[PDB]
Write an enzyme that holds these catalytic residues in place. Structure first.
Site, PDB file in Angstrom:
ATOM      1  N   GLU A   1       0.820  -1.228   0.000  1.00  0.00           N
ATOM      2  CA  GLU A   1       0.000   0.000   0.000  1.00  0.00           C
ATOM      3  C   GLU A   1       0.849   1.271   0.000  1.00  0.00           C
ATOM      4  OE1 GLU A   1      -2.447   2.653   2.241  1.00  0.00           O
ATOM      5  OE2 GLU A   1      -3.495   0.896   2.984  1.00  0.00           O
ATOM      6  N   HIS A   2       1.949   1.236   0.762  1.00  0.00           N
ATOM      7  CA  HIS A   2       2.953   2.298   0.788  1.00  0.00           C
ATOM      8  C   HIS A   2       3.757   2.422  -0.500  1.00  0.00           C
ATOM      9  CE1 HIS A   2       3.373   4.002   4.973  1.00  0.00           C
ATOM     10  NE2 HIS A   2       2.409   3.114   5.133  1.00  0.00           N
TER      11      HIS A   2
ATOM     12  N   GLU B   1       4.616   5.807  11.569  1.00  0.00           N
ATOM     13  CA  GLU B   1       3.155   5.616  11.598  1.00  0.00           C
ATOM     14  C   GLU B   1       2.692   4.739  12.747  1.00  0.00           C
ATOM     15  OE1 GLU B   1       1.866   4.384   7.729  1.00  0.00           O
ATOM     16  OE2 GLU B   1       2.335   6.315   6.835  1.00  0.00           O
TER      17      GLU B   1
END
Lengths: 53, 423, 60, 446
Positions: free
Chosen positions: D60-61, D137
């Site tokens: 996703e990153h 994060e």
């Protein structure tokens, strides 16, 4: 004067609690009968017989 | 394969009230009453009155009690909301199609028949503190409130939130006086989604014929300029730099809107570098730590504020402000490509079209338009209006920002945050 | 779902009133079956000895 | 005018097509000048093992940071330039990549989505940059007490199963997951029968289908191979995790019984019952007069800051219950009143409040499906979970069937005398002992 508790919701609420209140009476009747050895009712019960014959 | 959609219908009544409706054939209805009653209409004797008003919408009305509004709305699964800008209040109401009549009735009661009972108003005063506290957890809220206080003498300087000293001190009379001089036919618009125009027109003519109030979009906002500084040590510095720009629905406002997207508004890609954001790239060049920059663009009835907003580390703030301001200066000096204006035009056009995709965004746009312009401007003439912005106009908006008396608000550890004269 | 503790719970234990009813009905039939057994054990461990076993010697 | 009933019929049917590789392509057409398009994949942390947990999150990153055709920032430059919005999410069960765009831009938007899914150019230096970003994060998410308790509730409810894991993975996974780990994940999971091209807005289904053959057809034409890839049920427990931290100023508590999966009809009645209990926070107007007894008592007696009921669905299981945020001296009272409501609904739910819950759910459903994006999500998600789009008129039929008897039956089935999973974070000395939480799950009077 008690008219607060009369309407469709309280009619439903009573209906919900009826099987429960019936079963709590059925609990208490047998419990009274058992505690006192209530002779009148227990003569009917086909195996609980302390009195001979 | 959808139905061919209905056109929006629009009516100005002689008394100045505006009715606009759309029959989307939707399962739900949305109804808003938009009122020129925002915080700019407060003065120095009644600050915070429109905040307490915004909180007061389920208090008792004439034949609808507090209990009834809460229970009746919730029984049909509905909402009642009140949203406020510095210019407008907006009382909106949602339910299923079949339930419009009851929610309409609650709406009309809230807006035209509130009782403001002494004790109900009293029990509500602590809610100002809770509401303010929750809102002011975002540093952005402090900054933009201070920004408006710094920028203006007047009117637009007022906060959306009640001043602390006024909490407990706003009265039932002040609420009554506020409704009676602002909630009037010539200051109102009645918008409805998924209702008929005859029903709305009828509602408007029967229930929304009020006047005994003010006339204008106000006492005119005097832009002043200045800076407000709030020491925090918050690890991060939030700063906003601003100059006077253009009133809403002038041609110059569109130039500001386009410049905002040249310089860079929000992000487009989750976790992206913001490649075509010219402020962000300019700061990124000489700063190698966590930051943010956006162009800031607030347009009002009789004024505007344009510039930029920075978040940076305390030590980096000066550098981030100076990199950002130099990037604007560089567009004012004329270094702006035709493709860059076109991409900014694409972001603004698409942004606007996405803005009105939902019922909530459609109704708010139709409502504010009706208050600002007295009219409904369809999407394609907004797009035409955006297209007509020349390259020179965007250069001219940047020129106006660079040369114009500034306003600044900042918060954090401000030991390395510059004053206006240091810029 | 074939298992017997499951059907015991499903029919009798889930509701507290039914749970109480199954205890009181349970207590009646236990009192009989235990007093039947515990007397019969006590009488067998004392084979003659008690007036219940002597009884027949002195007449009707 | 039309009724509510009529208005649900006038909602246009979702058109579905299957491509030859097994990619499903689906669209709801409206009149809108803008659209949402995206790929919904049957992939998430429930598919991940201990050793590769957090891989999808890592992908996703990387998904937006370059392809074989659009290296580096070239993709985001194209998305930005047409004024499009490119977004992504990852759950335990579903991954999504979607574009908000102008309807005239649907050709390029589908072309970009295919490029992201098929041709992720995971450059070693880029995967190294993302290592530090994900790590930060994790530090950020530590400060969100809501996100922590829900991770905790999953970790305890699904104890030793893949549903216990976080989406992001542990920190050791983040610092040791290699490119080969990532491409293996991509190879195993990003396969045509497991993903859906969803769209909503100003588009014909025909051109959505055309672009799907144009850009997606090189995916599983002969790639239908290896152990393709059975999920297996997750054992729910009935257990407690209590992270005692008195340095935090408010307690978070989440409590849930085991729900049934996506498939089960019981979800509609459970959602009605959850609507009756509702949600609250401190910024809600008029507290005392709220219909929900919990919300009303919580407002008046200052019992909490917020609560929410939930029904989180997974394949063949879920988490059904509530979460709240309150002061240290209030957890006992909150838990008491919450449990009493569950018990009340099991035993003695009434006709009128069920109507209110039914109405709240019609209003929630319709108000949710409002915009190209939530509709596109719903097309995409529904085809993964139900295999159809369940039309609005069907939900209404399913809602309408629910009455008091159904609420009493369906709540009793999941709530009454069941072992909850409990998660506590913060000043939690007054959090009731688990035995006493277990005892709150039945009533001695009933």
């Amino acid at each position: 004067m008690l008219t607060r508790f009369l309407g469709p919701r309280y009619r439903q609420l009573a209906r919900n609690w009826v099987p429960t209140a019936s079963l709590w009476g059925a609990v208490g009747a047998v419990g009274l009968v058992w505690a006192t050895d209530w002779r009148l009712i227990l003569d009917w019960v086909p195996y609980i017989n302390g009195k001979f014959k | 394969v959808p139905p061919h959609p209905q056109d929006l219908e629009f009516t100005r009544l002689p008394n100045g009230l505006v009715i606009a409706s759309l029959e989307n054939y939707a399962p739900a209805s949305r109804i808003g009453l938009f009122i020129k009653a925002g915080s700019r209409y407060e003065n120095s004797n009644n600050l915070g009155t429109s905040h307490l008003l915004r909180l007061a919408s389920s208090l008792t009305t004439k034949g609808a009690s507090s209990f009834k509004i809460t229970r009746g709305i919730e029984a049909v699964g509905g909402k009642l909301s009140v949203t406020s800008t510095r210019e407008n209040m907006a009382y909106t109401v949602e339910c299923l199609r079949d339930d419009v009549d009851i929610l309409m009735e609650f709406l009309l009661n809230v807006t035209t028949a509130p009782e403001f009972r002494r004790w109900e108003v009293a029990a509500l005063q602590p809610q100002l503190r809770i509401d303010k506290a929750v809102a002011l957890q975002n540093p952005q809220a402090h900054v933009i409130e201070n920004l408006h206080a710094a920028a203006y003498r007047n009117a637009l300087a007022n906060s959306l939130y009640c001043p602390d000293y006024r909490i407990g001190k706003v009265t039932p009379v002040e609420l009554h006086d506020y409704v009676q001089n602002h909630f009037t036919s010539a200051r109102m618009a009645l918008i409805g989604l998924g209702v008929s125009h005859p029903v709305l027109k009828q509602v408007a003519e029967q229930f929304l014929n009020i006047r005994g109030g003010l006339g204008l979009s106000g006492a005119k906002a005097k832009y002043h300029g200045g800076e407000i500084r709030e020491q925090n040590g918050d690890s991060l510095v939030h700063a906003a730099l601003v100059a006077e720009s253009a009133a809403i629905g002038s041609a110059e406002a569109n130039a500001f809107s386009v410049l905002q997207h040249v310089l860079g508004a929000g992000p487009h890609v989750k976790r992206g570098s913001n490649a075509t954001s010219s402020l962000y790239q300019a700061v990124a060049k000489g700063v190698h730590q966590p930051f943010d920059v956006s162009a800031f663009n607030a347009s009002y009835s009789d004024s505007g504020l344009f510039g930029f907003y920075t978040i940076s580390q305390a030590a980096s703030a000066g550098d981030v402000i100076k990199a950002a301001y130099n990037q604007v200066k560089t567009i004012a000096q004329g270094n702006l490509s035709n493709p860059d204006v076109q991409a900014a035009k694409n972001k603004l056009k698409a942004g606007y079209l996405m803005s009105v995709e939902s019922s909530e965004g459609f109704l708010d746009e139709v409502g504010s338009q009706a208050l600002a312009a007295g009219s409904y401007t369809p999407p394609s003439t907004v797009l035409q209006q955006i297209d007509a912005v020349a390259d020179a106009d965007v250069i001219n908006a940047a020129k106006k920002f660079v040369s114009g008396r500034k306003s600044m608000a900042a918060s954090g550890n401000l030991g390395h945050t510059p004053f206006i004269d240091e810029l | 779902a074939p298992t017997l503790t499951a059907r015991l719970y499903s029919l009798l234990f889930r509701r507290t009133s039914t749970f109480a009813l199954t205890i009181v009905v349970g207590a009646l039939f236990f009192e009989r079956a235990f007093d039947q057994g515990a007397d019969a054990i006590y009488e067998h461990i004392n084979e003659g000895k008690l007036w219940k076993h002597i009884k027949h010697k002195y007449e009707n | 005018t039309a009724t509510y009933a009529q208005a649900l019929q006038s909602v246009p049917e979702t058109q579905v097509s299957q491509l030859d590789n097994g990619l499903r392509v689906a669209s709801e057409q409206s009149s809108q000048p803008t659209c949402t398009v995206g790929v919904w994949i049957d992939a998430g942390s429930r598919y991940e093992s201990e050793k590769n947990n957090g891989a999808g999150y890592f992908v996703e990153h990387l998904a937006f940071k370059g392809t074989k055709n659009r290296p580096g920032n070239a993709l985001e430059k194209e998305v930005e330039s047409m004024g499009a919005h490119l977004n992504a999410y990852s759950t335990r069960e579903h991954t999504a990549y979607y574009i908000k765009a102008l309807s005239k831009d649907l050709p390029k938007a589908v072309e970009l989505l295919a490029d992201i899914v098929q041709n992720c150019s995971l450059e070693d230096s880029q995967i190294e940059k993302e290592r530090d970003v994900i790590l930060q994060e994790l530090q950020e998410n530590d400060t969100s007490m809501r996100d922590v308790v829900f991770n905790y509730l999953h970790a305890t409810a699904f104890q030793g199963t893949p549903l216990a894991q976080s989406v992001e993975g542990p920190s050791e996974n983040v610092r040791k997951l290699s490119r080969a780990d990532l491409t293996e994940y991509l190879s195993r999971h990003y396969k045509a029968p497991r993903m859906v091209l969803a769209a909503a807005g100003g588009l014909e289904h025909r051109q959505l289908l055309d672009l799907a053959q144009k850009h997606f057809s090189g995916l599983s034409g002969t790639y239908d191979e290896d152990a393709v890839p059975t999920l297996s049920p997750c054992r729910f427990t009935g257990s407690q995790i209590c992270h005692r931290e008195d340095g935090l100023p408010l307690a978070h508590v989440a409590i849930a019984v085991e729900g049934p999966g996506w498939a089960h009809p019981d979800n509609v009645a459970l959602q009605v019952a959850n609507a009756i209990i509702g949600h609250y926070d401190c910024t809600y107007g008029g507290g005392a007069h709220l219909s929900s007894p919990l919300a009303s008592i919580a407002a008046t007696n200052k019992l909490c800051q917020s609560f929410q009921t939930f029904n989180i669905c997974y394949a063949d299981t879920g988490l059904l219950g509530a979460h709240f945020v309150c002061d240290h001296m209030s957890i006992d009272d909150m838990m008491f009143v919450l449990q009493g409501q569950w018990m009340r609904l099991c035993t003695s739910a009434t006709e009128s409040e069920v109507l209110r819950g039914k109405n709240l759910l019609r209003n929630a459903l319709v108000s949710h499906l409002d915009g190209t994006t939530p509709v596109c999500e719903d097309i995409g998600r529904s085809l993964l979970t139900y295999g159809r789009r369940i039309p609005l008129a069907e939900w209404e039929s399913r809602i309408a069937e629910v009455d008091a008897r159904v609420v009493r039956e369906v709540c009793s089935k999941y709530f009454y005398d069941q072992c909850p999973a409990v998660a506590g974070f913060g000043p939690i000395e007054q959090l009731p002992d688990y035995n006493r939480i277990r005892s709150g799950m039945f009533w001695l009077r009933f």
